[PDB]
């Protein structure tokens, strides 16, 4: 009657479940791959981040389920946030990240909360944080073949790149959310998308640089690194006015590779031997915080070694992915080559 979670915290979990609150919105995708062909069924409420935030995604939903909008959204960040201190939505369960005004509302008011692990370390923690999903949420079998899906196409990777010499990795550099804000070089240290480069056998540059697995370098050392790959991570919406790469559920490839060509000739970045020799990338952003992330972790392997990997097709697991445990056909474009 209770799980540990991935805080180490012990929660009462009763034996029902059919009211779900998504502490934050994007943990959708880690409740999608449980719910089979009814995806909002139990979700009484919602975080703004999917909608405002993944807007594309929203829409294909949508167009399947239109009664997606009458989810509520909770926290402030866009309004249709009706809920303030108004959860009169009696949740069953609440889910949210490991590391706050709604947690500790939650606590008081009785209602269990759960803490997953996707955005800090991916390596260690997507799988259990979907056993977990799997065991709050009642359902288990689900959970277990995704955990098998997510092992068997990761390990297509290690398989080849658990063999390569250290000093044969080819340096990797990931610009997060590339473009977008002011001061540059967001990026993923001892975690994160860290993670992705390491199972990818690349050489992130960026490991050493940083305390925690996010964080911010700056142009100078990234220049002063010369890395021989390049990625970038982005999720904007074709069309849209603020800069960064533009990948999802409703990006074409013609649109995407426009949007890095962009990204790829910005001062001081243009004058890597990484963008001008063939070598970049973007990714899609989301894949940061997802349980999808098994996507982004072949792509970065393809790349890397494109040899080896001639065998191996992201696109496929995808198409996997979506018709084993989700009720919306892929569409989109979630990475490219520059
Ligand atoms: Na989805
Ligand atoms: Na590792």
Same mark, same amino acid.
């Given at each position: 009657?209770?799980?540990?979670?991935?805080?180490?915290?012990?929660?009462?979990?009763?034996?029902?479940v059919?009211?779900?609150?998504?502490?934050?919105?994007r943990?959708?995708?880690?409740?999608?791959?449980?719910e089979?062909?009814?995806?909002?069924?139990?979700?009484?409420?919602?975080?703004?981040?999917?909608?405002?935030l993944?807007?594309?995604?929203?829409?294909?939903?949508?167009?399947? &389920?239109?009664?997606?909008?009458?989810?509520?959204?909770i926290?402030?960040?866009t309004?249709?946030?009706?809920?303030?201190?108004?959860?009169?939505?009696? %949740?069953?369960?609440?889910? &949210?990240?490991?590391?706050?005004?709604?947690?500790?509302?939650?606590?008081k008011?009785?209602?269990? !909360?759960?803490?997953?692990?996707?955005?800090?370390?991916?390596?260690? =923690?997507?799988?259990?944080?979907?056993?977990?999903?799997?065991?709050?949420?009642?359902?288990?079998?689900?959970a277990?073949?995704?955990?098998?899906?997510? @092992?068997?196409?990761?390990?297509?990777?290690?398989?080849?790149?658990?063999?390569? %010499?250290?000093?044969?990795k080819?340096?990797?550099?990931?610009?997060?959310?590339?473009?977008?804000?002011?001061?540059?070089?967001?990026?993923?240290?001892?975690?994160?998308?860290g993670? &992705?480069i390491?199972?990818?056998?690349?050489? =992130?540059?960026?490991? =050493?640089?940083?305390?925690?697995?996010?964080?911010?370098?700056?142009?100078?050392? !990234?220049?002063?690194?010369?890395?021989?790959?390049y990625?970038?991570?982005?999720?904007?919406?074709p069309?849209?006015?603020?800069?960064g790469?533009?990948?999802?559920? @409703?990006?074409t490839?013609?649109?995407?590779?426009?949007?890095?060509q962009?990204?790829l000739?910005?001062?001081?970045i243009?004058?890597?031997?990484?963008? =001008?020799?063939?070598?970049?990338?973007?990714?899609?952003h989301?894949?940061?915080?997802?349980?999808?992330?098994v996507?982004?972790?072949?792509?970065?392997?393809?790349?890397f070694?494109p040899?080896?990997?001639?065998?191996?097709?992201?696109?496929?697991?995808?198409?996997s992915?979506?018709?084993?445990?989700?009720?919306?056909?892929?569409?989109?474009?979630?990475?490219?080559?520059?």
């Open positions: 009657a209770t799980v540990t979670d991935m805080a180490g915290r012990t929660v009462t979990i009763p034996a029902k059919e009211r779900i609150l998504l502490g934050e919105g943990l959708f995708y880690a409740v999608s791959l449980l089979g062909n009814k995806p909002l069924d139990r979700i009484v409420g919602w975080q703004g981040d999917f909608r405002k993944d807007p594309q995604t929203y829409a294909i939903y949508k167009a399947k &389920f239109p009664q997606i909008d009458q989810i509520p959204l926290g402030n960040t309004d249709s946030i009706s809920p303030e201190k108004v959860l009169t939505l009696n %949740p069953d369960i609440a889910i &949210f990240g490991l590391s706050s005004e709604l947690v500790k509302q939650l606590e008011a009785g209602v269990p !909360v759960v803490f997953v692990d996707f955005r800090n370390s991916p390596l260690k =923690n997507t799988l259990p944080s979907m056993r977990l999903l799997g065991k709050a949420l009642h359902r288990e079998q689900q277990e073949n995704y955990i098998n899906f997510y @092992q068997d196409n990761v390990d297509k990777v290690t398989d080849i790149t658990n063999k390569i %010499p250290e000093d044969k080819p340096s990797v550099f990931i610009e997060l959310r590339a473009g977008a804000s002011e001061e540059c070089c967001g990026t993923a240290g001892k975690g994160n998308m993670d &992705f390491d199972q990818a056998g690349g050489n =992130n540059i960026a490991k =050493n640089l940083l305390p925690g697995s996010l964080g911010t370098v700056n142009l100078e050392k !990234v220049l002063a690194a010369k890395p021989d790959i990625i970038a991570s982005g999720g904007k919406s069309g849209s006015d603020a800069p790469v533009v990948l999802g559920a @409703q990006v490839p013609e649109q995407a590779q426009a949007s890095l962009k990204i000739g910005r001062k001081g243009n004058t890597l031997s990484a963008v =001008n020799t063939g070598h970049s990338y973007a990714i899609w989301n894949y940061y915080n997802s349980p999808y992330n996507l982004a972790i072949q792509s970065f392997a393809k790349w070694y040899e080896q990997f001639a065998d191996l097709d992201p696109k496929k697991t995808m198409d992915l979506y018709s084993q445990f989700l009720a919306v056909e892929p569409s989109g474009t979630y990475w490219i080559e520059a």
